[PDB]
Design a protein around this ligand. Structure first.
Ligand code: CA
Length: 240
């Protein structure tokens, strides 16, 4: 997250760190949203590599023990069947992970609430992106969970030529593009939390940024629109 501020420890309890094993260690690679005690919602592109993944819930500082983390293997990966790795612009960048065990819920570990099916945010709706991703374009991961206020940029505005053009679909949500604050590598797969009727809901799964860089004016961060996948999600979880 470029231009963020450190999150308070109990602000975003459904945020997870998706990590892959590298030798003796584990490396953070993406965010995710805990949606059931044994299910995590992340971006399909986070799990294209044939890696060994684990999810850490209750995580705050990647580099220190917080006394609040729980670590769980990933037991099954269900990517959206229409997902095409060389075509993130086509969308369907979403995946569900069934965890090998059900995690315990407490103040640091809660399920993320999802929007009702088809809900579209009005332009400039208030949202926060969260994650441990790069803090500067071509920078480094954050140690502590970062958050950044990113107002949505509606589809009409987002798909217009000065912004993302045909690259953005109505299956996506755009937010930010102020040239200061944005998602950045390592944030993919995590939540875009937006305030609606007084409650935060995870409206977006962080998908991509401009090849030009993370915080680029008129290239707002792009997310998979969770509200277009509600049946899919329930369908997957119901059959597994
Ligand atoms: Ca930690």
């Amino acid at each position: 997250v470029v231009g963020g501020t450190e999150a308070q420890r109990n602000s975003w309890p459904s945020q997870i760190s998706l990590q892959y094993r590298s030798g003796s260690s584990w490396a953070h690679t993406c965010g995710g949203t805990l949606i059931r005690q044994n299910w995590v919602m992340t971006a399909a592109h986070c799990v294209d590599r044939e890696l060994t993944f684990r999810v850490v819930v209750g995580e705050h500082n990647l580099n220190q023990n917080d006394g609040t983390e729980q670590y769980v293997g990933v037991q099954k990966i269900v990517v959206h069947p229409y997902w095409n790795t060389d075509d993130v612009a086509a969308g369907y960048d979403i995946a569900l992970l069934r965890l090998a065990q059900s995690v315990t819920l407490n103040s640091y570990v809660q399920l993320g609430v999802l929007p009702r099916a088809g809900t579209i945010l009005a332009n400039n709706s208030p949202c926060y992106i969260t994650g441990w991703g790069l803090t500067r374009t071509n920078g480094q991961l954050a140690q502590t969970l970062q958050q950044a206020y990113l107002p949505t940029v509606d589809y009409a505005i987002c798909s217009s030529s000065s912004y993302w053009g045909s690259t953005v679909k109505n299956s996506m949500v755009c937010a930010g593009g102020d040239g200061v604050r944005s998602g950045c590598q390592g944030d993919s797969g995590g939540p875009l939390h937006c305030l609606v009727n007084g409650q935060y809901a995870v409206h977006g799964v962080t998908s991509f940024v401009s090849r030009l860089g993370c915080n680029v004016t008129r290239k707002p961060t792009v997310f998979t629109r969770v509200s277009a996948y509600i049946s899919w999600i329930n369908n997957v979880i119901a059959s597994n």
